[PDB]
Point group: C3
Chain length 161, copies 3
């Protein structure tokens, strides 16, 4: 599986990128003084700082969207890299996703004009869809009758004794 | 691992189902005109459409609940299928979960009467619990003293030189 | 991979712990009578019980934070245990995380004084960062030129025919 290291690289970078969104999120909570919890606010000013803020809310939306897209890629990308895909093709799947999700986060936290984020979400979903269909195709091919699987490899049953 | 393809099928369908919840969610945002972001709203009417809506909120709750149930199944189901379970039994685990989570989403987005969703959540959690205990049992059996592991396979230590 | 069973143990316990947060969450919804859905509230009193509550909100924050930390550990910890790390070192990575995340949840649901939770989140992130860098290092070492990889193993190219 020559694809696997490329996948390990792109997926681990994406986790780290997610960890970074987390760090940005806490820093925004500190600067804006907007804590989710009473106990936090007490330690950083008083109860009035237990409140929401638009920038904190945005950071969480970005993080949640990562959870809805990157966690599936971790699973799909893994299984897919054990399916002997073309190595260049697999690199492309992984690079369209990494660059797309990195761009996604920049478009969210940078608040760029619509629909720039919305497009980067869709483009990044493209290789994920592709890997999913391919995995489904291979899983489904496993359960075909053996007579059909043989016919597809050029072998009809012999009537000869 | 004859169980693995069945698992790949059920788990990949579940990811796709999650992708579909995502698509429904965006479509509800468009129709109701309820965007999470100022920049989105500007592109689709004006700032007044940066607002929440009950149907959008529901879609997100459904999606989040998928994240809390399906992502663990992706991990548990994978490891479990490498534990040589009975193939029919493993199919049942995977089918009770797939059908249960599909039913769950129908009960949420369809807004069926309580407690229909709540039941489908619980029934679907059943095979997940089962796989988890089994994985824990196998992981734990690995760390037993060797003398106890041998005794359980009928072998007591010999006093003979 | 002697590390793998230790990982299976710590990771499956963490999933179960997450399932427990889920159960606590529903029980808090019942006692406080704070349901996310109109249909739920009808079955447990009336529409006035379709409302938020501070304790329900906290439970969800705890659960979400698990999703942002434990799901990556499931992926990182798996890959890492196939990297032949020292078995004791790997046990430490897995135990600092398990104990840290268990402590995290106690600090959230128990509402302990700031910044006790915030510290336990950070300490638990430590072995995750470590595993990630190590995975990145191994994935990156794979793509170095072969001449550099050989030099690092003591082999320069021979000019001899
Ligand atoms: C006041 N305080 C907070 N406050 C806080 C609170 Cl109460 C609520 C929310 C945030 C925002 N969070 C963040 O910015 C993260 C970096 C944790 C993601 C923060 Cl920063 N977090 C801490 C976190 C730590 C911390 O994690 N220290 C590093 C250690 F864990 F290794 F000890 C810490 O260590 C202090 C000491 C004396 C123990 O070194 C103090 C901390
Ligand atoms: C106006 N607009 C939006 N608006 C939008 C905004 Cl700003 C906010 C929220 C939503 C709801 N999202 C959805 O319904 C999803 C399908 C993306 C999940 C939407 Cl639909 N999303 C787009 C998304 C795309 C898009 O994804 N196009 C397909 C492409 F990515 F391949 F280019 C797009 O392409 C236009 C063009 C000219 C580039 O083809 C336009 C788009
Ligand atoms: C009234 N009710 C509810 N209500 C409800 C509603 Cl409508 C909304 C939110 C909650 C809180 N959820 C929880 O506490 C969970 C344990 C499900 C996490 C609850 Cl408890 N959930 C149920 C859940 C079940 C349930 O899961 N039963 C066990 C079964 F699935 F195996 F049938 C159930 O079974 C009743 C019967 C007659 C079918 O046994 C009834 C239930
Ligand atoms: N959970 C998403 C489902 C749809 C989705 O993923 N949309 C993309 C493209 S518009 C996105 O960037 N969503 C922003 C978000 O989740 O905050 C939502 O609420 O929008
Ligand atoms: N995060 C869940 C934890 C409990 C749970 O998963 N409950 C099931 C059965 S009542 C459910 O369908 N929850 C609906 C949801 O998460 O919106 C919640 O807030 O209810
Ligand atoms: N999503 C997190 C990102 C930062 C984070 O994980 N912080 C840790 C340490 S302060 C935490 O316990 N967060 C509490 C939470 O997510 O409710 C947030 O909103 O704070």
């Amino acid at each position: 599986s020559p694809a696997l290291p490329a996948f390990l690289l792109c997926s681990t970078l994406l986790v780290i990128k997610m960890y970074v969104v987390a760090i940005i999120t806490g820093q925004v909570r500190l600067r804006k003084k907007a804590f989710a919890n009473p106990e936090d606010a007490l330690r950083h000013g008083g109860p009035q700082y237990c409140r929401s803020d638009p920038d904190v809310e945005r950071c969480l939306r970005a993080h949640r969207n990562d959870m809805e897209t990157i966690y599936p890629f971790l699973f799909l990308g893994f299984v897919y890299s054990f399916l002997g895909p073309n190595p260049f093709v697999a690199w492309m799947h992984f690079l369209v996703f990494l660059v797309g999700r990195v761009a996604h986060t920049v478009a969210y936290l940078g608040k760029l004009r619509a629909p720039i984020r919305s497009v980067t979400y869709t483009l990044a979903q493209l290789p994920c869809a592709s890997m999913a269909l391919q995995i489904l195709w291979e899983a489904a091919r496993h359960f075909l009758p053996a007579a059909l699987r043989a016919a597809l490899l050029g072998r009809l049953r012999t009537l000869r004794p």
